[PDB]
Amino acid sequence: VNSFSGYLKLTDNVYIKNADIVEEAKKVKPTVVVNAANVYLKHGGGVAGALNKATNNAMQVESDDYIATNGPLKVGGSCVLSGHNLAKHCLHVVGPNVNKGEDIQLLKSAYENFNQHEVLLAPLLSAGIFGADPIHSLRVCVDTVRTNVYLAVFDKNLYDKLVSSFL
Numbered sequence: 703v704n705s706f707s708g709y710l711k712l713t714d715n716v717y718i719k720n721a722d723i724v725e726e727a728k729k730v731k732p733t734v735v736v737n738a739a740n741v742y743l744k745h746g747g748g749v750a751g752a753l754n755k756a757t758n759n760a761m762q763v764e765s766d767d768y769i770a771t772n773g774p775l776k777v778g779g780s781c782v783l784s785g786h787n788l789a790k791h792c793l794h795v796v797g798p799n800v801n802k803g804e805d806i807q808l809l810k811s812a813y814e815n816f817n818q819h820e821v822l823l824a825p826l827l828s829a830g831i832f833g834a835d836p837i838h839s840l841r842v843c844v845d846t847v848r849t850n851v852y853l854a855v856f857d858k859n860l861y862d863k864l865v866s867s868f869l
C-alpha cells in the first residue's frame with residue numbers, strides 16, 4: 703500500500719491523475735519525484751521551472767553545482783539529486799525536445815531511467831513545452847516502465863483525452 707490517492711489505474715503498474723505535480727509532491731512527499739529536465743538542468747519553464755520555483759530556487763542552485771562538476775546530461779539520460787521540500791529525491795530525466803529537433807526514439811531511453819526506482823511520481827516525458835504528442839508519451843511509458851509510476855497530468859482537458867483514448 704502507498705499514499706497516492708485519486709489515481710485511475712491504467713495497467714498493473716501505471717496510474718494517472720489530473721493534478722499539479724508540485725501540489726501532489728507537497729502532499730505525498732514521495733521517495734522520488736521526476737523532473738522534466740533539459741541537459742543543462744536549467745529550470746526556466748514547464749515542470750522544471752514550476753518544481754524549481756516550489757523549492758525557492760534551491761533545485762537550481764544544486765543543479766548548477768552538479769553541472770559545474772559533471773557537465774551536461776545526455777538526451778535520454780538522468781541524474782538523481784535532492785527532492786528538497788517536495789520529495790526525498792528528484793530524478794531529473796531528459797526526454798527529447800521536439801522544439802529542438804531531438805530523436806523521439808530517445809523517449810523510450812528516457813523512460814527506462816524510471817525502472818531504477820520502485821515507485822515514482824512523474825509527468826509525461828517530452829509533453830508540454832517539449833513538443834511531443836502526450837498520447838504517444840503515455841504509450842511509451844506503459845510499454846517501457848515496469849516499476850510503479852503515478853503520472854500527474856496538469857491540463858484537465860488533456861487528461862480526459864489521455865484516459866478516453868487509452869488502449
Ligand SMILES: O=C(O)C(c1ccccc1)c1ccccc1
Binds near residue numbers: 826829830854
Ligand atoms: O502536465 C504537465 O506535465 C505539464 C503541462 C503540460 C501541458 C500543459 C500544461 C502543463 C506541467 C507543466 C508545469 C507544471 C506542471 C505540469
